[PDB]
Symmetry: D2
Subunit: 323 residues, 4 copies
């Protein structure tokens, strides 16, 4: 008899289908930061990693596996084949390369049907850029209802904003509230009316808030949200830690059915004079069914016009794509 059988008496061998499984597709800097953040937050009982570069993928899996003693996620698997992803509650897409969008669309033509085949009832969380467009692409390819296709969107943009606000005020970002909505990245919209500490509106105290003529230049806090991201790419070549942590925050709400509100990208047709199938960030209630509800933010005329212009721009791109 084996040492195992001498030591251990087995009551049953039967294995359940995974109960709280997460898949991350793409094991680059973003994918792996999402993975480590998810693992240290105990969100999943099974983590699957998928990529096309097989050696890298295997090496990343093993490195995580070698840390198992320090974790509470007992099964970590990987493969090029999407059979390793079967029965995921949440599938996080971080893989990626008008040229660039279409190149990512082509990636998504392979990835998305494979995800759907093995986890037809999963929530999809899209991180790959440009995120708002590619969330739309994942929605179209998957055939999923809009509640189950979520884009990382402006979650990171808002986190950066709150970090910068906190620095200026001498307050932890958790107590510094403020929302950056619309299109992720360059064209995002800081909603000055919602910016507050303890329910005290900064805009009400300081009407120049968010205007060019502001003596304290509070507009620069949003400009530095965009300038931050370029600076990080310049200095280190890529962003990973902040995005990883932000994605894990979204995963927590979904896997634990928290119904917290996050600025994420959702299908926004029917609001703000937007009449096309575009995804943009608004505050959304996140839970076990993905996005169940959204907050209807009262926007100024200028805020509305910025969202509409993004919508037109995104749609101008999307209508040209071949699936």
């Amino acid at each position: 008899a084996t040492l195992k059988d001498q030591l251990i008496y087995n009551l049953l061998k039967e294995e359940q289908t995974p109960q709280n499984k997460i898949t991350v597709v793409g094991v680059g800097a973003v994918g792996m930061a999402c993975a480590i953040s998810i693992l240290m937050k105990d969100l999943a009982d099974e983590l699957a990693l998928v990529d096309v570069i097989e050696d890298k993928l295997k090496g990343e899996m093993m490195d995580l596996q070698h840390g198992s003693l320090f974790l509470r996620t007992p099964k970590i698997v990987s493969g090029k084949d999407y059979n390793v992803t079967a029965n995921s509650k949440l599938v996080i897409i971080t893989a990626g390369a008008l040229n660039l969008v279409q190149r990512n669309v082509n990636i998504f033509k392979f990835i998305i049907p494979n995800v759907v085949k093995y986890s037809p009832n999963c929530k999809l969380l899209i991180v790959s850029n440009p995120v708002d467009i590619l969330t739309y692409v994942a929605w179209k390819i998957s055939g999923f209802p809009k509640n189950r296709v979520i884009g990382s969107g402006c979650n990171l943009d808002s986190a950066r904003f709150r970090y910068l606000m906190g620095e200026r005020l001498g307050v932890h970002p958790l107590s510094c509230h403020g929302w950056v909505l619309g299109e992720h990245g360059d064209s995002s919209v800081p909603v000055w009316s919602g910016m507050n500490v303890a329910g005290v509106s900064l805009k009400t105290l300081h009407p120049d808030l968010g205007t060019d003529k502001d003596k304290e230049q509070w507009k620069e806090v949003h400009k530095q949200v965009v300038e931050s991201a370029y600076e990080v790419i310049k200095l280190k070549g890529y962003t990973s830690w902040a995005i990883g942590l932000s994605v894990a925050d979204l995963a927590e709400s979904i896997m634990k059915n928290l119904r917290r509100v996050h600025p994420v990208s959702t299908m926004i047709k029917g609001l703000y004079g937007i009449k096309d199938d575009v995804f943009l960030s608004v505050p959304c209630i996140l839970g076990q069914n993905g996005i169940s509800d959204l907050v209807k933010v009262t926007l100024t005329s200028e805020e509305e016009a910025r969202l509409k212009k993004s919508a037109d721009t995104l749609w101008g791109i999307q209508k040209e794509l071949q699936f």
Copy 2:
């Protein structure tokens, strides 16, 4: 009056110093894995990063800072000057290259260590840079620290890997699979078969051939896999980072929280196993707010003692020729 003043009435401006500061030196793959793991474990009120590559350092600092909303570490700083590391409780050294390998990290350490001791004379030093056992001795020699405050990550990771592999073979979580890999980090590490157990049941007693060539289940290969899988991971992804980062954060937890948990880390073993030279090797150590306060005297077979002694002679052979 600014908006800040309009919003916030200041009671006092009495500026403070951190109570639980940790410094990571070197922001490569290992350093940043240590940092993120330490950050997600809430071990520090201030994290300081140091490196010689200025753009990389600034950019990694910023990247962590940008995830502040999701953390409970209110200040992350970085700098080339070791004034940013002042009054660190714990300083983790992960800088250096991944006979020549040793002398070059020694040269790095001649710059780093005096600078650390200058600004944080009461810190615990935790050495990760390879070869970790040698560089722990080097840090101890240069710092002048008492041996309790100079700790090498040593075989904490090797033992973690062993327990992972043991667990896969037995179908038990690594937490519940007990087994110690001691001595030199890397090729010459020693699996202590006599200590291997689940629920206090000795596997060697149940399976006398455990760890010998006669073993039909080839358990000896589990230790071989521990030695190898590091090479395997370097071949596949170019480096190791996550496992070491997790293991360093586990050590940091015991130090920062004064837990007095036992970990296999590299310490001065002169006086044990017939070893007379000032060499660092891994034995199980009690880790707390004063670093290594105590060590466990593992009872080793003659073969096991001979193996540690051989390592001590080898390491000393390299160390006697190093120039400080």
Copy 3:
């Protein structure tokens, strides 16, 4: 339009089911400690509480709900009716007034006759974790009444005993209890068995270093450590009336392994028929692998002649009580 509808646009109203639901039956000191520990470890997406005292039950429910801001368990419910417990992954029984032993058995069997079928009705596929005393007898009872397979009926058993043991060992050694290993097995409480051969720090056997360990000839009286496990328990009851915090922490650790499918090894009470010459349907603590199917495997500990005699004696007594129980 209402304020809610002005503020919030609903995408869908599909009402789904909880994914990681835990029920605690009996909201006394033990049950509520279990509850707070489980809440603070983020093990559940829904917590249900059941008791027969309706006001106490509601107040406890409300008091936990009021701390929701500080937790990540979005739904806490309670009621006398078992419909609140539907679709639980794990149901923890801490019901029955605290404590002769046979009369304790008698009254807690009667309670179980009502509780267990209602639990099974609403959560046929749950794992049952029995804490109520005498825990070994009541684990048998839950298994008999429920009809569940052996893997899904777990008794808290010697989990607390072993934790107390490890605390005391750590105090004598100046080492954290996590790094002090040792197993108290067999019957929970007065008749538990400390397995001297397994006691170790860093794989170093204390018994090998110190052959008199656990014997009357031991000059350092290490046998008092196990005796103090027993004495500790009586002393806490004398001092504050009951045990709550330690048992609650110990139960949350078991829940952790089960909910997260960890396959960690814990000393818990399981059907031991087939080991140690025991041929009756008795539950006693051995080391068990715990995960999402409950107890999937158990460790076969080598016991001394004496240690084995004590388990065998316990098994004989327990079966003596159990064979006369009427179902």
Copy 4:
């Protein structure tokens, strides 16, 4: 050679001061709920309990200690003597007993407790939970001689938490994402600041201008009324409140011990605000960190809201001027 000496070689005996020590004074339901929550949040490296009931104190201590395997707080101590509390960063006071006697009786308790705490932990922060919390925070401040930054009253921290729970139930949103502030005097006279109530920075009052008035169709005023009715109801049903206060207190402790500078509604000396010029303590949003309350947020209040706080300050000072120290 003992077994310990055979197993373990000692490098140094030099034990240090505990670095992250918390004391809880009073081991009733509140105190112990604070204790367990602090332990499960890994905020301290040493916890000390004090009470005047000696058997209960030892038993609670031992019961916590027996859970040590599942915690990361390596030293739990207790005693009637305040020497067990030495070098605490933070001392939480939950000890406490017509109803104007009640105040003087808790003052009498504080006359004994506070000087002992100060003697052994001169640099601590004081966190007062005992009721009536606003008066008793003033009392602790007065007896201790501490700067105002180091005497913190639990105040409306629990009130606000209940409010956010209730708001969250009404909207179907997690309380974390439901923002709203209950300020002023803890308990029956607290003030809900309707102007600040929001989800995602979207003011409820702007959407629904009648919010919190008697003309309000939906009577959101009920949420605040329910905040007070809830606390009476919990007492009526289980005899005391424990779990929610324990959790809210651990949250305050987390900000202080980790120097987070988060903003919490806690009781601080509000002299010089809202037309108040007496030495009284009322809840406003405060920044909490390693030196306690360093800063407060100047909430824009309506005249009605300022008037309510003024009346509270007047009533509180009325009682305080009659107290015997």
